[PDB]
């Protein structure tokens, strides 16, 4: 095809030197210094494929072992996101389902099974379990929760937030999931302390819980799944379930530069998923008559979370490659490392919105000193 087109793409893609070996065996270094990353095309990827979606084209190529990489995938991608003219950023380049369940997740997530951003306190550099617990406290503290008040957790996962609210904050708690597997940890309420007077979980769609209202709403990792079109509706639902002057903590991946779907992620990991823009989200929040009372960005915390997940993934890769293919493992590793890079480069953020149904911060302390542990 075109060595010219490949040189244009690769030589403008990275803020550091990189070595490229092509399908005809020829090599070049782009940049000054000695390359820390070496990219090999075992096969030519058609220009026109790269031109319409580089993520999809290069991403499947990499999965197919038609591109190989020596050196950090994360650093490679982080590099691309720092360059306006790169295959990840330039508009010149933006014109399968695998069977996985709990056995898989068990191996690389912490004992808690939290598939969500963690929170690293300055004293904790890589204790993932400790950080997923700290995240739950970080969220709940923001509520300044009052003993005996009620909390709705929208998408309650394996119940870590729910149960911590009930056991440690004395909150009457309602959790909601559409996952049977997750619901069946109602067994924790019965076995834990028939925590039944202080906690229920419900196997239903949060979109219609009827006329009930809670003092607090939490929702971690839900709005990314909702889509642009229904984001307005999502915030109206949060508002609807809040009591007047009630407090929500809404937590989710948000893109400072404007919302986007990535074609590769959409095909392989999160079909339908969409990361909204910061402006977009604030608009949706205001349109539901919630007022923003605090906004916290936790970008670097997701970066670390995804790095540890990838470290764990690789450490258990022999096991995973036995059940799932080599192709699956490449895809998953690419996923975890590219996402880590997406946060590292500030292409994607994670944001905790403290919202009130009424004037900002009305039922809350005047200063944020209460928030931190």
Does the residue 92 lie in any domain? no
Backbone phi and psi for residue 63, each to the nearest 5 degrees, phi listed first: -60, -35
d(CA 357, CA 355): 7
DSSP, residue by residue, 1-19: --HHHHHHHHHTS-SS-EE
Contact (CB, 8 A) for 258 and 277:
yes
Between CA 181 and CA 178 the distance in angstroms is 9
Same-domain status, 75 and 223 = no
DSSP-assigned letters across all residues of 126-169: S-HHHHHHHHHHHHHHHT---TT-EEEEES-TTSHHHHHHHHHH
> 81-86 long-range CB contacts below 8 Å, 24 or more apart?
81/341, 81/342, 81/344, 81/345, 81/346, 81/347, 82/15, 82/345, 83/12, 83/13, 83/14, 83/15, 85/12, 85/13, 86/9, 86/12, 86/13, 86/14
Identify the residue whose tokens are 């309420």: 189
Give a yes or no: residue 165 inside a domain.
yes
Neighbouring-strand partners of residue 29: 19
Looking at the structure, do residues 72 and 121 belong to the same domain, yes or no? no
H helices of the chain, where?
A: 3-11, 47-52, 54-63, 73-82, 102-108, 128-142, 160-169, 180-183, 187-192, 231-241, 263-268, 278-287, 299-315, 317-323, 326-344
Is position 339 annotated as part of the catalytic site? Answer: yes
Method used for this model?
X-ray
Instruction: List Cβ<8 Å contacts ≥24 apart for 66-69.
Output: 66/41, 66/42, 67/39, 67/40, 67/41, 67/42, 68/39, 68/40, 68/42, 69/37, 69/38, 69/39, 69/40
35, 17 in Cβ contact below 8 A?
A: yes
* Structural domain for 48, as ranges: 1-83
Partners of 2 in the beta sheet? none
Same-domain pairing of 8 and 132: no
**Do both 167 and 60 map to the same domain?**
no
DSSP 86: S
User: What's the resolution in A?
Assistant: 2.7
**Residue 67 and residue 138 in one domain:** no
C-alpha–C-alpha distance, residues 234 and 152, integer Å: 14
Per-residue tokens: 103: 């056995």
User: Has residue 91 been placed in a domain?
Assistant: no
Contact in structure between 232 and 151 (CB atoms under 8 Å): no
Active-site residue identified among 117, 156, 329, 339: 339
Whether 30 is in a domain gets the answer yes
| 161 close to 138: Cβ distance less than 8 angstroms | no
Residues 114 and 73 in one domain: no
Is 154 within the bounds of a domain? yes
Domain membership of residue 234 (yes or no) is yes
């Amino acid at each position: 095809l075109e060595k010219t087109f490949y040189k244009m793409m690769l030589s403008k893609s990275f803020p550091f030197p990189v070595e490229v070996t092509y399908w005809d065996g020829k090599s070049e270094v782009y940049g000054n210094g000695t390359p820390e990353i070496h990219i090999t095309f075992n096969e030519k990827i058609p220009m026109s494929d790269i031109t319409k979606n580089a993520s999809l084209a290069l991403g499947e190529a990499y999965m197919d072992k038609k591109i190989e990489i020596q050196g950090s995938i994360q650093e490679l991608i982080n590099g691309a996101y720092q360059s306006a003219d790169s295959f990840m950023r330039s508009s010149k380049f933006r014109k399968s389902h695998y069977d996985i369940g709990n056995d898989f997740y068990k191996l690389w997530l912490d004992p808690t099974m939290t598939y969500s951003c963690a929170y690293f306190t300055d004293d904790n550099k890589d204790d993932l379990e400790q950080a997923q617990i700290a995240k739950v406290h970080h969220i709940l503290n923001k509520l300044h929760p009052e003993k005996g008040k009620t909390l709705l957790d929208i998408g309650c996962g394996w119940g870590t937030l729910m149960l911590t609210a009930a056991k440690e904050y004395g909150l009457k708690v309602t959790g909601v999931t559409l996952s049977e597997e997750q619901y069946k940890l109602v067994q924790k309420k019965i076995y834990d302390e028939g925590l039944e007077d202080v906690a229920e979980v419900k196997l239903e769609d949060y979109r219609e819980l009827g006329d009930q209202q809670w003092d607090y709403v939490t929702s971690v990792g839900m709005f990314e799944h909702v889509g642009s079109e229904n984001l307005g509706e999502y915030f109206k639902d949060v508002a609807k379930y809040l009591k007047n002057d009630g407090v929500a903590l809404i937590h989710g991946i948000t893109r400072q530069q404007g919302g986007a779907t990535n074609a590769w992620i959409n095909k392989y990991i999160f079909p339908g998923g969409y990361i909204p823009g910061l402006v977009e989200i604030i608009s949706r929040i205001e349109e539901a008559n919630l007022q923003v009372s605090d906004v916290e960005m936790l970008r670097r915390h997701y970066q670390r979370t995804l790095e540890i997940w990838d470290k764990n993934f690789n450490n258990a890769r022999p096991e995973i490659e036995k059940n799932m293919g080599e192709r699956f493992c490449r895809m998953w590793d690419l996923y975890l490392q590219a996402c880590a890079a997406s946060f590292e480069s500030g292409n994607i953020d994670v944001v905790q919105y403290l919202l009130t149904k009424g004037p900002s911060g009305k039922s809350l302390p005047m200063t944020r000193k209460y928030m931190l542990n």
